[PDB]
Design a protein around this ligand. Structure first.
Ligand SMILES: C[C@H]1O[C@H](O[C@H]2[C@H](O)[C@@H](O)[C@@H](O[C@H]3[C@H](O)[C@@H](O)[C@@H](O[C@H]4[C@H](O)[C@@H](O)[C@@H](O)O[C@@H]4CO)O[C@@H]3CO)O[C@@H]2CO)[C@H](O)[C@@H](O)[C@@H]1N[C@H]1C=C(CO)[C@@H](O)[C@H](O)[C@H]1O
Ligand SMILES: *[C@@H]1O[C@H](CO)[C@@H](O[C@@H]2O[C@H](CO)[C@@H](O)[C@H](O)[C@H]2NC(C)=O)[C@H](O[C@@H]2O[C@@H](C)[C@@H](O)[C@@H](O)[C@@H]2O)[C@H]1NC(C)=O
Ligand SMILES: *[C@@H]1O[C@H](CO)[C@@H](O[C@@H]2O[C@H](CO)[C@@H](O)[C@H](O)[C@H]2NC(C)=O)[C@H](O[C@@H]2O[C@@H](C)[C@@H](O)[C@@H](O)[C@@H]2O)[C@H]1NC(C)=O
Length: 827
C-alpha cells in the first residue's frame, strides 16, 4: 500500500550568465514507487523568460525525449539551452524561486506586490502536493489563496458558473459527450486558467497554461490546484498580466491570435439536422424573408450527403443541379451556404473519396491496418490529419467538391474523433489500459470509449494516446488550408472539437446543448470561457439542439443568442422545428433583437479586429472592463459585447424582470435611449423585462458606430452610419471603427485596403467637442461611407451645433474617411 510518489531533490541548479536569464536545474528522484507506474529518475528543469511578461517552466526527462506538441502544430519559441536559486528580470513583474528542500519546490511571485501566483512548495507529509513524474502520471500542484484567487478556464466543460467553483475535478479528454451534461469533459481541451486576484491590488490577474495534449484531471479545491496528466511533459507558462486583457494578449501571443471572421459570418445562421430536401431548405429561406427576419447563411446538415458520405449529394433529395440552383439563388440574394463535413470516410468500394484516401494511405492505423470506426454512414476510416499526405488529400477532396458546388464555409463536426463503437484494448498495452484513470465522462471511463483507441498510430509513429486531443485542431488547420487554397476570400469554418490554439483557425459552438432553461444560461459561461481560450467566435445552438423547445424558451433564447459572436439556430431531427418564424412572439423578438445586432455589425466587426490584434474577446466578462469591481468576478449571467455594452438576459421561465448587476455609473438602454440606470456604486437592479424585451445597455464613456438594419449584411453595409456617443462626467468618451471589404485575407495588412477610425467626445463647461482620427483616409473615402447622424446621451442639457436628455445631430453627410471635429454648445 505504497505512497503515490516520494518527490525530487535538486542536484544542481544555476542561473545562466550574460544572457536573457534562464535557470537550469537537474532533479534526482528521491525513492521509487510502484503506484501509477515507473518514476523518471532524472529530470531536466528549466525556468526562463520568453518575454518580460511570460515565464516558462519546462520539466522533462533528463535522459529521454518525451512527447511534446509538435512545433509545426503549435509554433513557439524553443527551450533555453533553505538553499534557493532565484530567477528574476529587471523589467519583469515575475520572480521565480527554486527551493532546494526535500522534496524540492518552486514558486513564482509578483515583484510589485509580493503576491504568490504559483506555489509548488510541497507539504512534505502530503505526496498529493509533490511534483511526481512517471511515464503516464505527471503531478504538479500549486497552493492558492482560497478567497483571493478567482479562477476561470480549463475547458471544455458545461458549468452554471463562469468562475470555477471550489472542490471539483475538471477532466480534459476530447469526447463526443453532449454539452447538456454539466461537469463532464466535452469536445475540447484547453489547459489554461486565468487567476484574478481580489487582493493585494484588486484586479491583479495572471494566466497559467500547461502546454500538454495528453489526457488530464485538474483538481481544484480552492486553496490548491493539481494537474494529474497521463503523459507528455510539464511545459508551464505563466502570463504576468496584470489586467485580464493583458493576460489574453500574452496567452494568444503564444497559442495564436484569433483568426479573423468574414463580415457575413456575423449575420444570422439557420441549420437543422433533418431537412428533407432542397425544397425544404428553399422553403425555410423564403419563410425567413416572408417573416422579414434577417437570415444570412443557410446550412445543410448530413441530410444533404448521399448516405452520409462526405463530398457527395443525395441524388434524389439534394440533386447537384437543384443544389447548384439553390446556392446561386442564395448568392444573388446576398446570402451564403455552409455544409457539414465529418472526418470519417465510409469504407465503400464505389466511393471515390475512399479510393483516393486508400491510394494515398491517408488513414489512421492500428495494428498496421486502417482503424475501422463507426459513424453516420456506418464503417469508416479516419484521415490522419497529422499526416501531410492526409492534409493534401483533404484539400483535394474539398477542391473537387467546391468545383461542383459553391460553398462559403465549412462546418467540421464529430472530430474528437467520435466513434459509435469502443474497440477492445490491445492486450498488455498500458496505453489502452493506463495506470491512472482520468475521470472520463465523470465515471473513470476508459479513454478509448467512443473514440479511436490510444494504441492507434499517426504519422511519425505518434500514438493516439499522445495526439488524441489534437485531432479536431489538426482537421481545422487542414480545412482552413483547403478553403484558403480554393478561394481568395477570408474563410469561415466552425469546429466542434478544439485544442488551445484552435482559435487561430476556426469558430466553435457549444455543441449538443438542450432546449432547457439551464442550457440557456450555460451558454454564457461557455461563451466567456472560449474568449479566454482565444476562440472569440463562439455561440450556442439557439433554442436548443436536443429535446423540443417551447415558444417561451425559444423567444428568450433568440433574445440572448442574437448577441452571441456566432449566432445560429440549429436543432436535432427528432424534435419539433424551431425556425424563428414559427411563432409570432419569437419572430417579433427576432426582428427587434436581430435588428439591433445588425445595427451593431460595424461594432462586432471592429471587436473581431481587436480580437485578432490583441486576443481580446468580443463577448467578454464584466471584469474585463471593471477589474477593480470584485462583485463582477462571480457574475455568470451577464456579459459585455466589447468594452461598454452589457447584455442582461432573462434566464427563467415566466419571469418579466431580471436582477442584473450594474457597475458604477450611468447606463442607457440601446432599445430606448430614454431608459437608463444610474448607480453611485455597483449594485443589483431589478430590470423590467417584458416577454418581448431583453436588456442591453451602454455605459458612459463609450462611442459606438452603428449602421442601419437590413435583411443581409451586404445591404446593412450600404446604409448611413449613426454614431452613438455616451458622455461621461468623469472621462472623455472614446470608440473605434475598423473597416475593410469584409473578406480580406490579411486583415489590417500592409496592402492598406482598410481604415481605422477613432472617435472622441469631451465636455467643457459651455461646450462639447466630438471628433475623429482616421488611419488610411483614402481607402475609407473610396467606399463612400457616410456618418449622417450623431446621437448624444449621458448629459442633462440639450446640445446643438454652433433627468438625462437626448440630443441628435442630423443631416451631417460626413464622410467617414475624413476626420472631423464637431463643436457643440449647451442650450
Ligand atoms: C445527434 C447527436 O447524436 C449523438 O449524441 C446523442 C446520443 O447518441 C444520445 O444517446 C444522447 O446521449 C446522451 C444520453 O442520453 C444522456 O443520458 C447522457 O449520458 C450521460 C449519462 O447521463 C451519465 O450518467 C454518464 O454516463 O455520461 C453519459 C454521457 O457520456 O449524455 C449523452 C450524450 O453524451 O444524446 C446525444 C446528443 O444528442 C452523437 O454522439 C452526437 O455527436 C450527435 N450530434 C452531432 C451530429 C449532428 C448530425 O450531423 C449535428 O446536427 C450536431 O450538431 C452534432 O453535434
Ligand atoms: C455504400 O454506398 C451505398 C450508396 O450510397 C450505400 O447504400 C445506400 O444506403 C442508404 C441508407 O443510408 C439507402 O437508403 C440507399 O438505398 C443505399 N443505396 C444503394 C444503391 O443501395 C451503402 O450503405 C449500406 O447499404 C444500405 C443498403 C444500408 O444498409 C446502409 O446502412 C449501409 O451502410 C454504402 N455501404 C456502406 C458499407 O456504408
Ligand atoms: C422609452 O422609455 C421611456 C422611459 O421609461 C418611456 O417614457 C415613459 O412612458 C410612460 C408611458 O408609457 C410614462 O408613464 C413615463 O412617465 C415615461 N417616462 C419618461 C421619462 O418619459 C417611453 O415611453 C413612451 O414611448 C411611447 C410609447 C409614447 O407613449 C411616449 O410618450 C413615451 O416616451 C419609452 N418609449 C417607447 C417607445 O416605449
Amino acid at each position: 500500500g505504497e505512497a503515490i510518489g516520494y518527490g525530487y531533490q535538486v542536484k544542481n541548479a544555476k542561473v545562466d550568465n550574460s544572457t536573457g536569464k534562464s535557470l537550469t536545474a537537474l532533479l534526482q528522484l528521491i525513492r521509487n514507487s510502484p503506484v501509477y507506474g515507473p518514476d523518471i529518475q532524472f529530470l531536466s528543469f528549466t525556468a526562463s523568460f520568453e518575454e518580460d511578461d511570460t515565464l516558462r517552466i519546462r520539466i522533462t526527462d533528463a535522459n529521454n525525449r518525451r512527447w511534446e506538441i509538435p512545433n509545426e502544430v503549435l509554433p513557439r519559441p524553443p527551450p533555453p539551452p533553505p538553499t534557493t536559486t532565484v530567477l528574476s528580470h529587471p523589467h519583469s513583474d515575475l520572480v521565480f524561486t527554486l527551493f532546494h528542500t526535500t522534496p524540492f519546490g518552486f514558486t513564482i511571485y509578483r515583484k510589485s506586490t509580493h503576491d504568490v501566483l504559483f506555489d509548488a512548495t510541497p507539504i512534505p507529509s502530503n505526496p498529493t502536493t509533490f511534483l511526481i513524474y512517471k511515464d503516464q502520471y505527471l503531478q504538479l500542484s500549486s497552493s492558492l489563496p482560497a478567497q483571493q484567487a478567482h479562477l476561470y478556464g480549463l475547458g471544455e466543460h458545461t458549468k452554471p458558473t463562469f468562475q470555477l467553483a471550489h472542490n471539483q475535478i475538471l477532466t480534459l479528454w476530447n469526447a463526443d459527450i453532449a454539452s447538456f451534461n454539466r461537469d463532464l469533459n466535452l469536445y475540447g481541451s484547453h489547459p489554461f486558467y486565468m487567476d484574478v486576484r481580489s487582493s493585494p491590488m484588486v484586479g491583479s490577474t495572471h494566466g497559467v497554461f500547461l502546454l500538454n495534449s495528453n489526457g488530464m484531471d485538474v483538481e481544484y479545491t480552492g486553496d490548491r490546484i493539481t494537474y494529474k496528466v497521463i503523459g507528455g511533459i510539464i511545459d508551464l507558462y505563466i502570463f504576468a498580466g496584470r489586467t485580464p486583457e493583458m493576460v489574453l494578449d500574452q496567452y494568444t501571443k503564444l497559442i495564436g491570435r484569433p483568426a479573423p471572421m468574414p463580415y457575413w459570418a456575423f449575420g444570422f445562421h439557420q441549420c437543422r439536422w433533418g431537412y428533407r430536401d432542397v425544397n425544404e431548405i428553399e422553403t425555410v429561406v423564403d419563410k425567413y424573408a416572408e417573416a422579414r427576419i434577417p437570415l444570412e447563411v443557410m446550412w445543410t446538415d448530413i441530410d444533404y450527403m448521399d448516405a452520409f458520405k462526405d463530398f457527395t449529394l443525395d441524388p434524389v433529395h439534394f440533386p447537384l443541379d437543384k443544389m447548384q440552383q439553390f446556392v446561386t439563388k442564395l448568392h444573388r440574394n446576398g446570402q451564403r451556404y455552409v455544409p457539414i463535413l465529418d472526418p470519417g470516410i465510409n469504407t465503400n468500394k464505389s466511393y471515390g473519396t475512399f479510393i483516393r484516401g486508400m491510394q494515398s494511405n491517408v488513414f489512421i492505423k492500428r495494428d498496421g491496418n486502417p482503424y475501422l470506426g463507426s459513424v453516420w454512414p456506418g464503417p469508416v476510416y479516419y484521415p490522419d490529419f497529422l499526416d501531410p499526405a492526409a492534409r493534401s488529400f483533404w484539400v483535394d477532396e474539398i477542391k473537387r467538391f467546391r468545383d461542383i458546388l459553391p460553398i462559403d464555409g465549412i462546418w467540421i463536426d464529430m472530430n474528437e474523433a467520435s466513434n459509435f463503437i469502443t474497440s477492445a484494448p490491445t492486450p498488455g498495452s498500458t496505453l489502452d489500459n493506463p495506470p491512472y484513470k482520468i475521470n472520463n465522462s465523470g465515471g473513470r471511463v476508459p479513454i478509448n470509449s467512443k473514440t479511436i483507441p490510444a494504441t492507434a498510430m499517426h504519422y511519425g509513429n505518434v500514438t493516439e494516446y499522445n495526439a488524441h486531443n489534437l485531432y479536431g485542431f489538426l482537421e481545422s488547420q487542414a480545412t482552413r488550408e483547403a478553403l484558403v487554397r480554393t478561394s481568395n476570400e477570408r474563410p469561415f469554418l466552425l469546429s466542434r472539437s478544439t485544442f488551445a490554439g484552435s482559435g487561430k483557425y476556426t469558430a466553435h459552438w457549444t455543441g449538443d446543448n438542450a432546449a432547457r432553461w439551464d442550457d440557456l444560461q450555460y451558454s454564457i459561461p461557455t461563451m466567456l470561457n472560449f474568449g479566454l481560450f482565444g476562440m472569440p467566435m463562439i455561440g450556442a445552438d439557439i433554442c436548443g439542439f436536443a429535446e423540443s423547445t417551447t415558444e417561451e424558451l425559444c423567444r428568450r433564447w433568440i433574445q440572448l443568442g442574437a448577441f452571441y459572436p456566432f449566432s445560429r439556430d440549429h436543432s436535432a431531427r427528432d424534435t419539433t422545428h424551431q425556425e424563428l418564424y414559427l411563432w409570432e412572439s419569437v419572430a417579433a423578438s427576432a426582428r427587434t433583437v436581430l435588428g439591433l445586432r445588425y445595427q451593431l455589425l460595424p461594432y462586432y466587426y471592429t471587436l473581431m479586429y481587436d480580437a485578432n490584434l490583441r486576443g481580446i474577446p468580443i463577448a467578454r466578462p464584466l471584469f474585463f472592463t471593471f477589474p477593480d469591481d470584485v462583485a463582477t468576478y462571480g457574475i455568470s449571467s451577464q456579459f459585455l459585447i466589447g468594452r461598454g455594452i452589457m447584455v442582461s438576459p432573462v434566464l427563467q421561465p415566466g419571469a418579466v424582470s431580471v436582477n442584473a448587476y450594474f457597475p458604477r455609473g450611468n447606463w442607457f438602454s440601446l432599445f430606448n435611449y430614454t431608459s437608463s440606470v444610474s448607480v453611485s456604486a455597483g449594485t443589483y437592479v431589478s430590470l423590467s423585462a417584458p416577454p418581448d424585451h431583453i436588456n442591453v445597455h451602454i455605459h458612459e464613456g463609450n462611442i459606438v458606430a452603428m449602421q442601419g438594419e437590413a435583411m443581409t449584411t451586404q445591404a446593412a453595409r450600404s446604409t448611413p452610419f449613426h454614431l452613438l456617443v455616451v458622455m461621461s462626467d468623469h472621462v472623455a468618451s472614446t470608440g473605434e471603427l475598423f473597416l475593410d471589404n469584409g473578406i480580406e485575407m490579411d486583415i489590417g495588412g500592409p496592402g492598406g485596403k482598410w481604415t481605422l477610425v477613432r472617435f472622441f467626445a469631451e465636455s467643457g463647461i459651455n461646450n462639447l467637442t466630438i471628433s475623429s482620427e482616421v488611419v488610411n483616409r483614402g481607402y475609407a473615402m473610396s467606399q463612400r461611407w457616410v456618418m449622417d447622424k450623431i446621437t448624444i446621451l449621458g448629459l442633462k442639457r440639450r446640445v446643438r451645433i454652433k433627468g438625462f436628455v437626448v440630443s441628435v445631430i442630423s443631416d451631417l453627410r460626413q464622410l467617414v474617411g475624413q476626420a472631423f471635429k464637431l463643436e457643440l454648445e449647451f442650450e
